[PDB]
Structures are given as C-alpha cells and as structure tokens.
Amino acid sequence: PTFNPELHAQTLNSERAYFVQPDADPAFTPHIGALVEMLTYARLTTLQAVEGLPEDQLWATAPGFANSIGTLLAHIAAVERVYHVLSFQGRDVTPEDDGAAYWGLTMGKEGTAPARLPTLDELRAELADARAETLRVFAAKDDAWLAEPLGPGWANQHWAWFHVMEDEVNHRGQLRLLRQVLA
Amino acid sequence: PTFNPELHAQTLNSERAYFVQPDADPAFTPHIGALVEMLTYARLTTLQAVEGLPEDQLWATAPGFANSIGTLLAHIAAVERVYHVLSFQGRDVTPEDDGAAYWGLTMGKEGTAPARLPTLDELRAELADARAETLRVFAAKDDAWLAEPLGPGWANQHWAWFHVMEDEVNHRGQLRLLRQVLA
Numbered sequence A, B: 001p002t003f004n005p006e007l008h009a010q011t012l013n014s015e016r017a018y019f020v021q022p023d024a025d026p027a028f029t030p031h032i033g034a035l036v037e038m039l040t041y042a043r044l045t046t047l048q049a050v051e052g053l054p055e056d057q058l059w060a061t062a063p064g065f066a067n068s069i070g071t072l073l074a075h076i077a078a079v080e081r082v083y084h085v086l087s088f089q090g091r092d093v094t095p096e097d098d099g100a101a102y103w104g105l106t107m108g109k110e111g112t113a114p115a116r117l118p119t120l121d122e123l124r125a126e127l128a129d130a131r132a133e134t135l136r137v138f139a140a141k142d143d144a145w146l147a148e149p150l151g152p153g154w155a156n157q158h159w160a161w162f163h164v165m166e167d168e169v170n171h172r173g174q175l176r177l178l179r180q181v182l183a
Ligand code: NI
Pocket: A075, A079, A167, A171
C-alpha cells in the first residue's frame, strides 16, 4: 500500500486530528506510522496558521520578526527537501548541488533565489509536493531503517524526520505571532 | 525499571541528542520510549533557549510579544501538569480544582496566581518536577495504554503526550525571537 489520505486527519475540525494512530494505514510500519501522524498534524497546524492571510502581508516583516510569513513557509518546505537529500539520497546538501533548497533553508541568505517570489498558493503547493515525496519514500521503508544512522552521519533516521516535524512547529509558533502583529 | 537519565540525551552537545532510540531504556515500551526521546529533546531545546538569560528580562514583553519568557516557561510546565490530570487522573481540569496549573495554562489570565512570581531557577525546577512525574507514570504504562482514548474524551493518550511536546516546541520558537528582541 501507499499513503491513503482518508486514513489520516484531513482537517483540524475532526476528532481524527487528536488521535495518533500508528497502525491507521497499512502503507507504514509502526514508528514510521507514528511519524506520519505527527508530520500530518504539524502540517495541518501550519496551514491553519496562514489560512486566509491577506496576500499583501506575505513578505512583510516587523520589529523582532526578521523572517516574513513567506520566508518561513519557504523554509519549512526547504527543510523537508534538505532531509530528502540527507535521509533518502544519503549525502550532504550544498549550495552548489541544492541551491533552491539552500535558499529556503537559510532564510534567503545563501543558495539560489527564485526568479520571482512565490505566491501563498505556490508556497502551499511546494509544501504539499515536498510532503508527497516524504510519504512515497516512507511507504518503502521499515522501522529497522528508521533506526539507522544517516549516511552523512551525526543523527539517525528517526531523529531526522522528528526534526523536520519539530522545526515546522517551531516556526509555526513564530508564524502565529507575526500574523497577529501584521493583521 | 524506572527512567535512567544516562540512557537518554543529557546535553545538546552530544551525538546522543540527535538519535531517537525507542528501545534505549528498558523502563519504557516502544512508542512510549519514542515519546520520551522527543519530550527530552524538546526540553533540552527549551532550556538552551533561556540559558544565560539576564534575570531582569524574565518578565519583559515587547511589541508582538504579549507573553514574557517567564510567562511562556510557566505555561510549558503548566500544560504538562494539565495533561497529568487529563491523561493520568482521567478528569477535566477546572480553575476551581487546578488553579495554579490553570494560571500557567492561560498565560496568567485565569486561575490562581502565585504569591510572588517565580525566579528563572524556580521556573526550571518546576519544569523538571513536572517532567519527573510524567516519566514516573510512563514507566508504569504500555503501548496499549497509549492507544486508549482519554477519560474525558476527544483525543487519545498518544496524541495528548505528543501535544505536550509539540506545544513546548511552538512556544520555544516564540522564546527564541523574544530573547533576541530583548537581548
Ligand atoms: Ni528552521
């Protein structure tokens, strides 16, 4: 099996979003399944935080908030893209080889900037596309894989994917405050 | 067995902090073990965020930041205390029965305020004390328990403890920005 969205939370407006069910979906082994639930919840809460945002506020900053909502959304997707390289391809990321991801990763300070800045819809599409790739690969792996060190070292697979989730939540806390300042 | 701190990350300055090892500690069943690792990592990162903070900044606010660092640290501990009630005792929390926790939970707006505000050391002691109680109880439970609905309903045990971790990380993102504004 592959990821079936109907077996996971699709909205925060349901009791499903408040259950972590590691065996919900036969596409995933148990620890991987638990990660999928957590990643799903983190993404639903990121999207709720920016839902309805006036588009003229997307790149706005404020005192104490050096990174705009758009910058943070680019960053969240880019961290996932970076971990596809570290976790799935097994190599370190560089600005040479991974320029777009590196730009997102570094809040636009390094790497390769896009030709024009993305719209909010494009940012959400890139978030979804990154996540689709994660879930594709997760369906191919098992919990023994999750215990392995990363190819480039210094962490294990379980931590790496936890970190993708945790960093999203970290920046979503920031997004909540910035939106409130701007709006 | 009960929680042995030597079997878990004790510092962010070690490769141990970047491994999630659900079977590290015989005190815990696998999904519970994974939560413990995640909760541990979240707490280490909260403490790093406030380490060395000048104490005169503890209750300071700034434009866009209605909740001070002290308020957020009180909140993080209080959410854990609230979940001890919901998860372990099996009842809803009220301002009548859980006044101190309710004050932390609500950023000081409801509930029962302390006689005087805590110092940074006291805030960290309360964080540690709350966590000790969590780990005590986790050693008594198994993964079947983690799948159960909460007694007061609306979530499962697995989600509840995930949420304690995730909300900490959310507010730690806020703490990072506030400290940078003040300092
Ligand atoms: Ni980040």
